[PDB]
Amino acid sequence: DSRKTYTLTDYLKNTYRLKLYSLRWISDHEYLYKQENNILVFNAEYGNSSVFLENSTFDEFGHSINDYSISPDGQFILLEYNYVKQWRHSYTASYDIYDLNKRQLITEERIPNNTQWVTWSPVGHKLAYVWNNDIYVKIEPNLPSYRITWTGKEDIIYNGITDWVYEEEVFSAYSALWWSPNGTFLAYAQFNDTEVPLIEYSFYSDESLQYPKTVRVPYPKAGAVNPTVKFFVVNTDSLSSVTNATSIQITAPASMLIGDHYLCDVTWATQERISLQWLRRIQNYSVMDICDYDESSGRWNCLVARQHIEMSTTGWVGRFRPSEPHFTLDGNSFYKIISNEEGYRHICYFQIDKKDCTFITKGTWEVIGIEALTSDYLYYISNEYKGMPGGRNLYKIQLSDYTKVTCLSCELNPERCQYYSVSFSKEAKYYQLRCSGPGLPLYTLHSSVNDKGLRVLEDNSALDKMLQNVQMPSKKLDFIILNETKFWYQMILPPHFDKSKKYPLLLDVYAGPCSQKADTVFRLNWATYLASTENIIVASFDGRGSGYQGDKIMHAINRRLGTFEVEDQIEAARQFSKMGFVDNKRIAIWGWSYGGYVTSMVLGSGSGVFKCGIAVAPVSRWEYYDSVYTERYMGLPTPEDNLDHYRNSTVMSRAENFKQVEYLLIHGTADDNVHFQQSAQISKALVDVGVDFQAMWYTDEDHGIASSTAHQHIYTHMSHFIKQCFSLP
Amino acid sequence: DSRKTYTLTDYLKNTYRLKLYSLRWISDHEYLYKQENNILVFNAEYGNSSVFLENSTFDEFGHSINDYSISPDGQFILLEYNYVKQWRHSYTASYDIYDLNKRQLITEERIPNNTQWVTWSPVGHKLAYVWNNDIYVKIEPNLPSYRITWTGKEDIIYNGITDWVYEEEVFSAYSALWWSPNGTFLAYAQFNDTEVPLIEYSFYSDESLQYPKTVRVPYPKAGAVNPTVKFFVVNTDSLSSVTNATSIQITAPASMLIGDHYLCDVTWATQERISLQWLRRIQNYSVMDICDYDESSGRWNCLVARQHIEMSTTGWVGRFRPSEPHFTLDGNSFYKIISNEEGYRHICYFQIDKKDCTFITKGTWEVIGIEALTSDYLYYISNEYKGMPGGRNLYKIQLSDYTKVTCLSCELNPERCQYYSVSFSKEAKYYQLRCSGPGLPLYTLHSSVNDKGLRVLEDNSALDKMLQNVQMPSKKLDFIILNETKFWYQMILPPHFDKSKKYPLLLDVYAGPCSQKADTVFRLNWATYLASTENIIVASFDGRGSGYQGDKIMHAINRRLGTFEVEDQIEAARQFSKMGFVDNKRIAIWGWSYGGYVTSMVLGSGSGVFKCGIAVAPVSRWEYYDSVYTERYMGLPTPEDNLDHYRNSTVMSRAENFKQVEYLLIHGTADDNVHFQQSAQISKALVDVGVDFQAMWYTDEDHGIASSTAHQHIYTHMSHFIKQCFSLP
Ligand SMILES: *[C@@H]1O[C@H](CO)[C@@H](O[C@@H]2O[C@H](CO)[C@@H](O[C@@H]3O[C@H](CO)[C@@H](O)[C@H](O)[C@@H]3O)[C@H](O)[C@H]2NC(C)=O)[C@H](O)[C@H]1NC(C)=O
Ligand SMILES: *[C@@H]1O[C@H](CO)[C@@H](O[C@@H]2O[C@H](CO)[C@@H](O[C@@H]3O[C@H](CO)[C@@H](O)[C@H](O)[C@@H]3O)[C@H](O)[C@H]2NC(C)=O)[C@H](O)[C@H]1NC(C)=O
Ligand SMILES: *[C@@H]1O[C@H](CO)[C@@H](O[C@@H]2O[C@H](CO)[C@@H](O)[C@H](O)[C@H]2NC(C)=O)[C@H](O)[C@H]1NC(C)=O
Ligand SMILES: *[C@@H]1O[C@H](CO)[C@@H](O[C@@H]2O[C@H](CO)[C@@H](O)[C@H](O)[C@H]2NC(C)=O)[C@H](O)[C@H]1NC(C)=O
Ligand SMILES: *[C@@H]1O[C@H](CO)[C@@H](O[C@@H]2O[C@H](CO)[C@@H](O)[C@H](O)[C@H]2NC(C)=O)[C@H](O)[C@H]1NC(C)=O
Ligand SMILES: *[C@@H]1O[C@H](CO)[C@@H](O[C@@H]2O[C@H](CO)[C@@H](O)[C@H](O)[C@H]2NC(C)=O)[C@H](O)[C@H]1NC(C)=O
Ligand SMILES: *[C@@H]1O[C@H](CO)[C@@H](O[C@@H]2O[C@H](CO)[C@@H](O)[C@H](O)[C@H]2NC(C)=O)[C@H](O)[C@H]1NC(C)=O
Ligand SMILES: *[C@@H]1O[C@H](CO)[C@@H](O[C@@H]2O[C@H](CO)[C@@H](O)[C@H](O)[C@H]2NC(C)=O)[C@H](O)[C@H]1NC(C)=O
Ligand SMILES: *[C@@H]1O[C@H](CO)[C@@H](O[C@@H]2O[C@H](CO)[C@@H](O)[C@H](O)[C@H]2NC(C)=O)[C@H](O)[C@H]1NC(C)=O
Ligand SMILES: *[C@@H]1O[C@H](CO)[C@@H](O[C@@H]2O[C@H](CO)[C@@H](O)[C@H](O)[C@H]2NC(C)=O)[C@H](O)[C@H]1NC(C)=O
Ligand SMILES: *[C@@H]1O[C@H](CO)[C@@H](O)[C@H](O)[C@H]1NC(C)=O
Ligand SMILES: *[C@@H]1O[C@H](CO)[C@@H](O)[C@H](O)[C@H]1NC(C)=O
Ligand SMILES: *[C@@H]1O[C@H](CO)[C@@H](O)[C@H](O)[C@H]1NC(C)=O
Ligand SMILES: *[C@@H]1O[C@H](CO)[C@@H](O)[C@H](O)[C@H]1NC(C)=O
């Protein structure tokens, strides 16, 4: 054996890059793929291409265009420059509209600088943008903007944008603007954070800054006042400069109004029908209101009969939040993913006039998501193939005959692709199946008309040839029967693996509620380096609390976080140790966020199975985390509700047992998700008891700690600790 | 040998304690020494004792009495309970006045809770206290308080108390109240921090606290607006309840009014004469105003003729601040320590009517301080004995015949005591000479009448016997001739030291301007453990910038901090290495505060002499430290004045060279002196360049990091790092 190993340098410097083919379906037959800084239009059926915009077009722009947005009409394009990131999704940027017919930059009534969000109408060239927490609408790109809201304020009234809590948990986005299917109406949400308490952390900026800046973010910790959401809808077609626009408010269902409620999701059904999903602060009761517009009163009305209530007594409602409904063209019938009586999520045909729901799919698998609803077929990704919870394959079901279900990707390349994803065209005429593993990522375009594979867009052939030279580690995904239940685990076995020889084992852990750490995706990460060079088996286990395996396993840790999942990881290590190739004296664990919470808990468990551990940005007490996430799985922190578990599930409590393990606590000073407070309290507890541990603070670094320099430094420091603890060279 | 060694446990658990005899001279013949929780009165001449207050007296108090204050009359006592510390000197506490004649606790008009400062009149039982930044005076302990100021405000107007900058630099205390010699007048200072910018750091309090508290302290960084000081004097004898008291303001000399000025010190001369020392922001010009009270106008007047101006073109005026004048009983003549033309500080007889000053002492030594001015003799401590800059001995000079100077402690116990300190009685009839080394601390009481040693109060005999069993390390203080100048150094040689054998060397460093690290004091510190058990020579060197050696050496680093002192420490290590008993391959350096700045600078020097280093609470850029300290030595951070050196003296700049040394950066999150910001910037710089280093943040810990738990953990972690770097067992 005389080949190079995957070194940390290769990982940090991204020497081996996984080519990807990302396209934008502008039509049912054409998509826009950016090549050599040139936007190109590709006919899906023929396969030919044409230059939509030459790089020279914006070479004289004078600014670096971060991203572009083609108007549905295709007569205009948005240019994003001066991109400034805020949180995971939130950002501010300047925008310049470019005419694609006159080949000229719009210079009059330009979108203002620091625009928080900008969106084209679903059809046409209307532009709605949020500036200074305020919503403006430009009916024509070259015409003056029309201001809709006037109550926008910073860290108080968010109009059209989402506050930290909603952006990171409820909507998973920074956009609260929902255009009507033809762009007649614009649905928006007004979040009020007047009462939500502020988390205050210090920012040191650059060396030039003399006095540090304090950053205050409206952040509702478990039990703290949550934000108030108010939904609104405005007729954009009636927008006038003479008078302000009028926004009709759709009130929440009375059940939600009794107490704190959340607007989980907003989905347009027809040009005059909208579906609002509300969920009470106690996330075990959710009502969907199919509201329609009444022409006579010009006001949207929600029929109590059409309302659909989904309650869960076993645990929380939804994997992370109520799913999205896929209405039919008529809009009087919709398909949604609901949990079956057995406890496995499946598609359920729904009619707006019948509260009864008819499940169209059933089994011990789980419908991961609905991709497209054509008048004849509904396409969904599922983990049914080979009963593998970590597999994703495309399936289509005849709407008229539900019994006729056909797999579309299961038997394409079974050896190389088992985790598939899909992006259909405007009318689902053509779809791009993208496989992420277990082999190299493969991107292929197919035609729904005859389910025929038109061509292969990307095959990662060059990377494959380069990876032949390096001694890449192998990945093993199997299951261990615990309490007569199959719990799957993945193991990145080192190259030239010998079962007889005993190798050190690092248990990468997350164990988040409804999370999967054992899948079939090819990933070039730090574990690849650890297994290839340091020869460390990197393993991950999905125990009670893991998702894609049913409500029973997912809702097992309900109202008891830091209990079953922590125990399962320790039991996993014991099973892994007795397999025969694991050095019992050298077993470690590492995790990020919830993984850090579990990593700390297992190290302080006093089990004696683990020797050392690295907790990065770890959660210490659940009363320091946001309300939406914590209250969903731990309930309210009140003396009459799980207050005991809230206090019994703190890492600080197990500090005395940390004296038997080596601990590395890494955290970013400017973390908005898991505040540095949580890491700080862990350190204080260990210092008080006298536990000796290593720590590393990264100044002005967020939860991701992904700044090139910090990313390299964090993994370099972690590599040193793991090697030192494992007594490796 | 079988003798045990001084272990870290002995140091952390204070196994060997140095007994001390601290007394309070209530009279010229009697002092109060607390024994077994009983205040006892001891006649100095006879040596007999009597119980002033039995422990039972305050056993039923119900609170823990932190400290006591006997009224000069002795008819009343103050009891301090509920002690809450703020900064180094600032604190808040509740006080209960106790009658020492009626043996009863005063229950009416009690001193309010959270009293910031309380002081008895110099003679009598008057009480002046500052509550809520406001000054109140109780003429009688059992009578209602009289409020003097009414403009007090938190973090804005400090009346009678010193702001952070003045408390930690100018006055080195939290008291701005100065009682007149017979208590007729009360001199006070009003500090205004309305413009001084606030340093904001986060406090994580306890595990219960859900949201961290942001602590904002008025702190003037180099160049930032400094606080405004206004002096005032009030006649307490005329205090009435019917009308408010009137405070006469003594304005600063015109020279100081031209720009920012500081009130360095306030010293009362007679019952009607006060001496104010003012210093401009540019600390190289100071004027002392001897102001007297004019009965006719009832206003204090400062004669321009009586003003004494001291300017220094070589460097800053004063060791750290203008010295304190010692006026004669008449008050028309005073003695002060001024630097001579040669550049060595010496006592200088002064007359209020003659601007000329006559030096009464001269030589290549330095008068450390004036202790007592009797009508016939002036007592001062100096480093003249054996030309040792680190020695302190008591001397007395006949005022009539200055040639007649007599040493009082030089030849008492030359082998055991060379560093002496003294506390005279009310009329200097008796004085307690306390020696801190080089042998065990020895406390003795003497009589000035015939300079006779009455008796020995404490001899640390028990500690001496216990220290016989342990293998205590030895201390060597010598000098290395650099550039034809004697630079002294101390070395804590390990037990059973063999010059032939090569031992590892750790250079404890501070190198602060006007600082001494090589002295003759016996200290049981971490170095004792390192030398006794780990067998590491701990050495300290006093190079350019050191004090007690003359203005030339002290003012050498003027307007150039981080230059000569850093180079000298590296040169010291080179000289130490070629001595013959130092392992060149294993030399390290550690420091706190300025020591941390030097430690970082020498590690990033690129010299290659040092292998590893530990910087605790280190200063990174001088533009982050307070103004009074930085501007005194580095000038103003302005483009026209030393702005370059300010940017050329940053640790972050030498980050690339840290790649050759092991670095441990320890800092407390809640540091008010060296803000964490300085450590944070160092870390960010190393992270950016890619320098691998270890770090450790101590949550809710101040500059001292002296909380029992943290103190033990910091030295434990530091011990591990030093041993690991020195490849020690
Ligand atoms: C966002 O939430 C805050 C807090 O609920 C809202 O502030 C509230 O605004 C109402 C407006 O009517 C205030 O009611 C009035 O208060 C005044 C005194 O301030 C009183 O004289 C009136 O009789 C009436 O009660 C309410 O007090 C106030 N609450 C506060 C300040 O805590 C705010 O309006 C909300 N913003 C939006 C756009 O929804
Ligand atoms: C402590 O320092 C601050 C800052 O110098 C002092 O505040 C100042 O107070 C004076 C009072 O006369 C203000 O002057 C007046 O201001 C008002 C507007 O606020 C204006 O209408 C008047 O004609 C006059 O100029 C001055 O502006 C103000 N400076 C500020 C607020 O920055 C404060 O009084 C000082 N405190 C003490 C007790 O010395
Ligand atoms: C790919 O080739 C086809 C022809 O085989 C193109 O289709 C025609 O393109 C011409 C271009 O001038 C049009 O005038 C015709 O109307 C098109 N015919 C149809 C049926 O659409 C197609 O446009 C090409 N695609 C690209 C991206 O160049
Ligand atoms: C549209 O609404 C805005 C906001 O209320 C109006 O602008 C305000 O008009 C009032 C009139 O008294 C002023 O006091 C405010 O200062 C204005 N601005 C704001 C931000 O409140 C505007 O006039 C309305 N337009 C029409 C035609 O009704
Ligand atoms: C977009 O959709 C809206 C809602 O259906 C359309 O508005 C209605 O259009 C019909 C047909 O012209 C009218 O009879 C209704 O009175 C309209 N309702 C309202 C609220 O005005 C709108 O015309 C559609 N736009 C386009 C271009 O098709
Ligand atoms: C949603 O969760 C709450 C909190 O667990 C449930 O309220 C409890 O209901 C049970 C009976 O089912 C009572 O014994 C408890 O005392 C209630 N409160 C608490 C604090 O547990 C509520 O019933 C749940 N709702 C649904 C639809 O399951
Ligand atoms: C130490 O002893 C001396 C006597 O040798 C004490 O002096 C006398 O003490 C009595 C006590 O009742 C007084 O009445 C006398 O007036 C004292 N004489 C003088 C000259 O002072 C002295 O008080 C004793 N000291 C202590 C602390 O008990
Ligand atoms: C002593 O000074 C205080 C402070 O100025 C006086 O108390 C104030 O009196 C005014 C009279 O109009 C009130 O408006 C204030 O509210 C009072 N308090 C404060 C804190 O300002 C007090 O009256 C004065 N006493 C005498 C006898 O003059
Ligand atoms: C404390 O000292 C002050 C200042 O010397 C004395 O006040 C003066 O006392 C003399 C003598 O009685 C008077 O002639 C002056 O008019 C007083 N000046 C003022 C400002 O009142 C005061 O008497 C001394 N107190 C005691 C008890 O000796
Ligand atoms: C106090 O220090 C300041 C700053 O160094 C001195 O001002 C400088 O004086 C020199 C001459 O001695 C000039 O060449 C400089 O231009 C002055 N300004 C600066 C920015 O350096 C001042 O003279 C000193 N005062 C005394 C009494 O020594
Ligand atoms: C711009 O596009 C042309 C298209 O032929 C390509 O050759 C050229 O390399 C591109 N330049 C950049 C900087 O991408
Ligand atoms: C954005 O800022 C730049 C720079 O000040 C300015 O030239 C431009 O006109 C601004 N755009 C808008 C729409 O305000
Ligand atoms: C209180 O004082 C008496 C004086 O004889 C002493 O015996 C006793 O030990 C003291 N108690 C404490 C707790 O110091
Ligand atoms: C201080 O507070 C305690 C507790 O409330 C109270 O008993 C006491 O009287 C207070 N003292 C004064 C002087 O206010």
mmCIF file with all atom_site columns, N, CA, C and O in Angstrom, chain A residues 63 79 81-84 92-96 110-118 129-132 136:
data_model
loop_
_atom_site.group_PDB
_atom_site.id
_atom_site.type_symbol
_atom_site.label_atom_id
_atom_site.label_alt_id
_atom_site.label_comp_id
_atom_site.label_asym_id
_atom_site.label_entity_id
_atom_site.label_seq_id
_atom_site.pdbx_PDB_ins_code
_atom_site.Cartn_x
_atom_site.Cartn_y
_atom_site.Cartn_z
_atom_site.occupancy
_atom_site.B_iso_or_equiv
_atom_site.pdbx_formal_charge
_atom_site.auth_seq_id
_atom_site.auth_comp_id
_atom_site.auth_asym_id
_atom_site.auth_atom_id
_atom_site.pdbx_PDB_model_num
ATOM 1   N N  . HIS A 1 63  ? -19.686 46.177 -9.051  1.00 0.00 ? 63  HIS A N  1
ATOM 2   C CA . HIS A 1 63  ? -19.883 45.503 -7.741  1.00 0.00 ? 63  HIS A CA 1
ATOM 3   C C  . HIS A 1 63  ? -19.904 43.991 -7.972  1.00 0.00 ? 63  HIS A C  1
ATOM 4   O O  . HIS A 1 63  ? -20.152 43.558 -9.115  1.00 0.00 ? 63  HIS A O  1
ATOM 5   N N  . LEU A 1 79  ? -30.287 42.009 -9.230  1.00 0.00 ? 79  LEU A N  1
ATOM 6   C CA . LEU A 1 79  ? -28.852 41.762 -8.935  1.00 0.00 ? 79  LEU A CA 1
ATOM 7   C C  . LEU A 1 79  ? -28.605 42.048 -7.451  1.00 0.00 ? 79  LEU A C  1
ATOM 8   O O  . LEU A 1 79  ? -28.844 43.191 -7.031  1.00 0.00 ? 79  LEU A O  1
ATOM 9   N N  . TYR A 1 81  ? -26.106 42.782 -4.516  1.00 0.00 ? 81  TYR A N  1
ATOM 10  C CA . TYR A 1 81  ? -24.702 43.169 -4.222  1.00 0.00 ? 81  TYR A CA 1
ATOM 11  C C  . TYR A 1 81  ? -24.648 43.739 -2.802  1.00 0.00 ? 81  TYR A C  1
ATOM 12  O O  . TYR A 1 81  ? -25.724 44.006 -2.234  1.00 0.00 ? 81  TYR A O  1
ATOM 13  N N  . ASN A 1 82  ? -23.445 43.898 -2.246  1.00 0.00 ? 82  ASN A N  1
ATOM 14  C CA . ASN A 1 82  ? -23.296 44.407 -0.856  1.00 0.00 ? 82  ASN A CA 1
ATOM 15  C C  . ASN A 1 82  ? -24.020 43.456 0.102   1.00 0.00 ? 82  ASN A C  1
ATOM 16  O O  . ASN A 1 82  ? -24.760 43.952 0.972   1.00 0.00 ? 82  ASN A O  1
ATOM 17  N N  . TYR A 1 83  ? -23.810 42.148 -0.054  1.00 0.00 ? 83  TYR A N  1
ATOM 18  C CA . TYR A 1 83  ? -24.488 41.139 0.803   1.00 0.00 ? 83  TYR A CA 1
ATOM 19  C C  . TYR A 1 83  ? -23.929 41.192 2.226   1.00 0.00 ? 83  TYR A C  1
ATOM 20  O O  . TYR A 1 83  ? -22.706 41.035 2.388   1.00 0.00 ? 83  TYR A O  1
ATOM 21  N N  . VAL A 1 84  ? -24.796 41.398 3.222   1.00 0.00 ? 84  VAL A N  1
ATOM 22  C CA . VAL A 1 84  ? -24.358 41.403 4.650   1.00 0.00 ? 84  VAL A CA 1
ATOM 23  C C  . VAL A 1 84  ? -25.219 40.389 5.407   1.00 0.00 ? 84  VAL A C  1
ATOM 24  O O  . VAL A 1 84  ? -26.437 40.621 5.509   1.00 0.00 ? 84  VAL A O  1
ATOM 25  N N  . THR A 1 92  ? -28.941 41.371 4.717   1.00 0.00 ? 92  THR A N  1
ATOM 26  C CA . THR A 1 92  ? -29.317 42.660 4.076   1.00 0.00 ? 92  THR A CA 1
ATOM 27  C C  . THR A 1 92  ? -28.424 42.866 2.850   1.00 0.00 ? 92  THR A C  1
ATOM 28  O O  . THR A 1 92  ? -27.235 42.513 2.932   1.00 0.00 ? 92  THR A O  1
ATOM 29  N N  . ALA A 1 93  ? -28.979 43.408 1.765   1.00 0.00 ? 93  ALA A N  1
ATOM 30  C CA . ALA A 1 93  ? -28.192 43.571 0.522   1.00 0.00 ? 93  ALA A CA 1
ATOM 31  C C  . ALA A 1 93  ? -28.801 44.674 -0.347  1.00 0.00 ? 93  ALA A C  1
ATOM 32  O O  . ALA A 1 93  ? -29.978 45.013 -0.124  1.00 0.00 ? 93  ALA A O  1
ATOM 33  N N  . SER A 1 94  ? -28.023 45.216 -1.287  1.00 0.00 ? 94  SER A N  1
ATOM 34  C CA . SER A 1 94  ? -28.557 46.229 -2.231  1.00 0.00 ? 94  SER A CA 1
ATOM 35  C C  . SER A 1 94  ? -28.960 45.511 -3.519  1.00 0.00 ? 94  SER A C  1
ATOM 36  O O  . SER A 1 94  ? -28.307 44.505 -3.851  1.00 0.00 ? 94  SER A O  1
ATOM 37  N N  . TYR A 1 95  ? -29.998 45.990 -4.207  1.00 0.00 ? 95  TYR A N  1
ATOM 38  C CA . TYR A 1 95  ? -30.492 45.266 -5.407  1.00 0.00 ? 95  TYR A CA 1
ATOM 39  C C  . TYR A 1 95  ? -30.589 46.222 -6.598  1.00 0.00 ? 95  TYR A C  1
ATOM 40  O O  . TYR A 1 95  ? -31.044 47.364 -6.405  1.00 0.00 ? 95  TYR A O  1
ATOM 41  N N  . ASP A 1 96  ? -30.181 45.765 -7.785  1.00 0.00 ? 96  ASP A N  1
ATOM 42  C CA . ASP A 1 96  ? -30.305 46.597 -9.014  1.00 0.00 ? 96  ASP A CA 1
ATOM 43  C C  . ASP A 1 96  ? -31.087 45.811 -10.070 1.00 0.00 ? 96  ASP A C  1
ATOM 44  O O  . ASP A 1 96  ? -30.607 44.741 -10.483 1.00 0.00 ? 96  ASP A O  1
ATOM 45  N N  . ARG A 1 110 ? -34.917 52.878 -7.784  1.00 0.00 ? 110 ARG A N  1
ATOM 46  C CA . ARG A 1 110 ? -34.143 51.635 -7.528  1.00 0.00 ? 110 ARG A CA 1
ATOM 47  C C  . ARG A 1 110 ? -34.489 51.081 -6.142  1.00 0.00 ? 110 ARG A C  1
ATOM 48  O O  . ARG A 1 110 ? -34.811 51.886 -5.250  1.00 0.00 ? 110 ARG A O  1
ATOM 49  N N  . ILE A 1 111 ? -34.410 49.759 -5.973  1.00 0.00 ? 111 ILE A N  1
ATOM 50  C CA . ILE A 1 111 ? -34.664 49.142 -4.638  1.00 0.00 ? 111 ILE A CA 1
ATOM 51  C C  . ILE A 1 111 ? -33.681 49.761 -3.642  1.00 0.00 ? 111 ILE A C  1
ATOM 52  O O  . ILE A 1 111 ? -32.482 49.820 -3.962  1.00 0.00 ? 111 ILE A O  1
ATOM 53  N N  . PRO A 1 112 ? -34.129 50.223 -2.454  1.00 0.00 ? 112 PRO A N  1
ATOM 54  C CA . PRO A 1 112 ? -33.244 50.913 -1.509  1.00 0.00 ? 112 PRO A CA 1
ATOM 55  C C  . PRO A 1 112 ? -32.090 50.037 -1.005  1.00 0.00 ? 112 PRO A C  1
ATOM 56  O O  . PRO A 1 112 ? -32.202 48.832 -1.083  1.00 0.00 ? 112 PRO A O  1
ATOM 57  N N  . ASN A 1 113 ? -31.019 50.662 -0.511  1.00 0.00 ? 113 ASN A N  1
ATOM 58  C CA . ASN A 1 113 ? -29.888 49.891 0.066   1.00 0.00 ? 113 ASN A CA 1
ATOM 59  C C  . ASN A 1 113 ? -30.368 49.181 1.334   1.00 0.00 ? 113 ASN A C  1
ATOM 60  O O  . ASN A 1 113 ? -31.394 49.609 1.892   1.00 0.00 ? 113 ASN A O  1
ATOM 61  N N  . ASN A 1 114 ? -29.655 48.137 1.766   1.00 0.00 ? 114 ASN A N  1
ATOM 62  C CA . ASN A 1 114 ? -30.012 47.422 3.020   1.00 0.00 ? 114 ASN A CA 1
ATOM 63  C C  . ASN A 1 114 ? -31.441 46.878 2.926   1.00 0.00 ? 114 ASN A C  1
ATOM 64  O O  . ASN A 1 114 ? -32.158 46.946 3.942   1.00 0.00 ? 114 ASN A O  1
ATOM 65  N N  . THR A 1 115 ? -31.838 46.360 1.761   1.00 0.00 ? 115 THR A N  1
ATOM 66  C CA . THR A 1 115 ? -33.178 45.727 1.643   1.00 0.00 ? 115 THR A CA 1
ATOM 67  C C  . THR A 1 115 ? -33.119 44.359 2.325   1.00 0.00 ? 115 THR A C  1
ATOM 68  O O  . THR A 1 115 ? -32.254 43.553 1.937   1.00 0.00 ? 115 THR A O  1
ATOM 69  N N  . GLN A 1 116 ? -34.001 44.109 3.294   1.00 0.00 ? 116 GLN A N  1
ATOM 70  C CA . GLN A 1 116 ? -33.936 42.843 4.073   1.00 0.00 ? 116 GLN A CA 1
ATOM 71  C C  . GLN A 1 116 ? -34.423 41.660 3.227   1.00 0.00 ? 116 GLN A C  1
ATOM 72  O O  . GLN A 1 116 ? -33.804 40.584 3.319   1.00 0.00 ? 116 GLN A O  1
ATOM 73  N N  . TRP A 1 117 ? -35.486 41.849 2.440   1.00 0.00 ? 117 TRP A N  1
ATOM 74  C CA . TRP A 1 117 ? -36.042 40.747 1.607   1.00 0.00 ? 117 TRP A CA 1
ATOM 75  C C  . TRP A 1 117 ? -36.630 41.313 0.311   1.00 0.00 ? 117 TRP A C  1
ATOM 76  O O  . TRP A 1 117 ? -37.228 42.396 0.381   1.00 0.00 ? 117 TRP A O  1
ATOM 77  N N  . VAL A 1 118 ? -36.460 40.614 -0.817  1.00 0.00 ? 118 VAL A N  1
ATOM 78  C CA . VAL A 1 118 ? -37.066 41.051 -2.111  1.00 0.00 ? 118 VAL A CA 1
ATOM 79  C C  . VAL A 1 118 ? -37.617 39.813 -2.824  1.00 0.00 ? 118 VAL A C  1
ATOM 80  O O  . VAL A 1 118 ? -36.921 38.782 -2.818  1.00 0.00 ? 118 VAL A O  1
ATOM 81  N N  . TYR A 1 129 ? -40.740 44.135 -1.479  1.00 0.00 ? 129 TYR A N  1
ATOM 82  C CA . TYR A 1 129 ? -39.471 44.084 -0.707  1.00 0.00 ? 129 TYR A CA 1
ATOM 83  C C  . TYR A 1 129 ? -39.694 44.659 0.696   1.00 0.00 ? 129 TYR A C  1
ATOM 84  O O  . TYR A 1 129 ? -40.544 45.554 0.850   1.00 0.00 ? 129 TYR A O  1
ATOM 85  N N  . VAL A 1 130 ? -38.959 44.141 1.683   1.00 0.00 ? 130 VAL A N  1
ATOM 86  C CA . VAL A 1 130 ? -39.080 44.655 3.079   1.00 0.00 ? 130 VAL A CA 1
ATOM 87  C C  . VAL A 1 130 ? -37.847 45.502 3.399   1.00 0.00 ? 130 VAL A C  1
ATOM 88  O O  . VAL A 1 130 ? -36.730 44.953 3.364   1.00 0.00 ? 130 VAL A O  1
ATOM 89  N N  . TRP A 1 131 ? -38.051 46.787 3.690   1.00 0.00 ? 131 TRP A N  1
ATOM 90  C CA . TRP A 1 131 ? -36.928 47.692 4.046   1.00 0.00 ? 131 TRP A CA 1
ATOM 91  C C  . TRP A 1 131 ? -37.248 48.362 5.384   1.00 0.00 ? 131 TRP A C  1
ATOM 92  O O  . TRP A 1 131 ? -38.355 48.914 5.509   1.00 0.00 ? 131 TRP A O  1
ATOM 93  N N  . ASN A 1 132 ? -36.322 48.301 6.345   1.00 0.00 ? 132 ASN A N  1
ATOM 94  C CA . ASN A 1 132 ? -36.563 48.880 7.694   1.00 0.00 ? 132 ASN A CA 1
ATOM 95  C C  . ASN A 1 132 ? -37.824 48.257 8.301   1.00 0.00 ? 132 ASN A C  1
ATOM 96  O O  . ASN A 1 132 ? -38.699 49.027 8.738   1.00 0.00 ? 132 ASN A O  1
ATOM 97  N N  . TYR A 1 136 ? -42.788 47.222 1.052   1.00 0.00 ? 136 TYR A N  1
ATOM 98  C CA . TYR A 1 136 ? -43.097 48.118 -0.092  1.00 0.00 ? 136 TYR A CA 1
ATOM 99  C C  . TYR A 1 136 ? -43.350 47.236 -1.318  1.00 0.00 ? 136 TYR A C  1
ATOM 100 O O  . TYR A 1 136 ? -42.751 46.149 -1.394  1.00 0.00 ? 136 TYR A O  1
#
